[PDB]
Amino acid sequence: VSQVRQNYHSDCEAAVNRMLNLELYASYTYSSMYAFFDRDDVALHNVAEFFKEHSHEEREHAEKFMKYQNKRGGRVVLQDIKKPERDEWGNTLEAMQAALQLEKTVNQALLDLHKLATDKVDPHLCDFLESEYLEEQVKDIKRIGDFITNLKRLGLPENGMGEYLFDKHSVKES
């Protein structure tokens, strides 16, 4: 037993490792979206940079789980990072829809981890999830939903001018 370990259930330790993997998976998916929007036959560079930024954020969230694991006396166990579901992402609307689904998948896993931590009476883990993950998750879901609404308003997928304008006005110029 680790000398630091206190009130940290084996099930929570394992679930933290699984959540770490999911954050890495999410990061990799966003990296794929970045590369897609940087293609010469896609060429929406502010959209590309948006997804690149989100890839980096998810990788930071994975690292934060590694640090958490060690702080509690658990042991990091890594698994393969599966490649993303798609090799090409269609257009800005399709990609944003996939991102919304991904963020809700990650949110569900965080909420499930919170249920487990609650079950095992681990208030430190509950607080960590609430303070470092749950609020920023709701904000990302809201932002992406807002974007989807605007992409539909702009006539995606058919309205190429609308898609061009979204890249200029909705996502930060990069």
Contact positions with Mg ion (CB under 5 A) in 73-102: 90
C-beta of 11 vs 43, nearer to its own copies: 43
The yes or no reply on residue 137 touching Mg ion (CB under 5 A) is yes
> From Cl ion, Mg ion, Fe ion, none, which one binds at residue 23 (CB under 5 to 8 Å depending on kind)?
Fe ion
Residues 67-80 as b or e (16 or more Cβ within 10 Å = b): ebbeebebeeeeee
| 58 annotated among ligand-binding-site residues | yes
The rounded distance, in Å, linking the Cα atoms of 19 and 65 is 8
The rounded distance, in Å, linking the Cα atoms of 77 and 19 is 11
Residues 23-62 touching Fe ion, rule: CB under 5 A, are 23, 58, 61
Q: What is the CA radius of gyration of the chain?
A: 18
Residues 144-158 as b or e (16 or more Cβ within 10 Å = b): beebbebbeebebee
The yes or no reply on residue 78 touching its own copies (CB under 8 A) is yes
C-beta of 131 vs 174, nearer to its own copies: 131
The yes or no reply on residue 140 touching Mg ion (CB under 5 A) is yes
User: In this structure, what DSSP letter does residue 122 have?
Assistant: -
Residue 6 has φ and ψ, to the nearest 5°, of -155, 125
Residues 103-162 touching its own copies, rule: CB under 8 A, are 104, 107-108, 111, 114-115, 118, 121, 123-124, 126-131, 134-135, 138-139, 141-142, 145-150, 152-155, 159-162
The yes or no reply on residue 140 touching Fe ion (CB under 5 A) is no
**Which residues are documented as binding site?**
23, 58, 61, 103, 137, 140
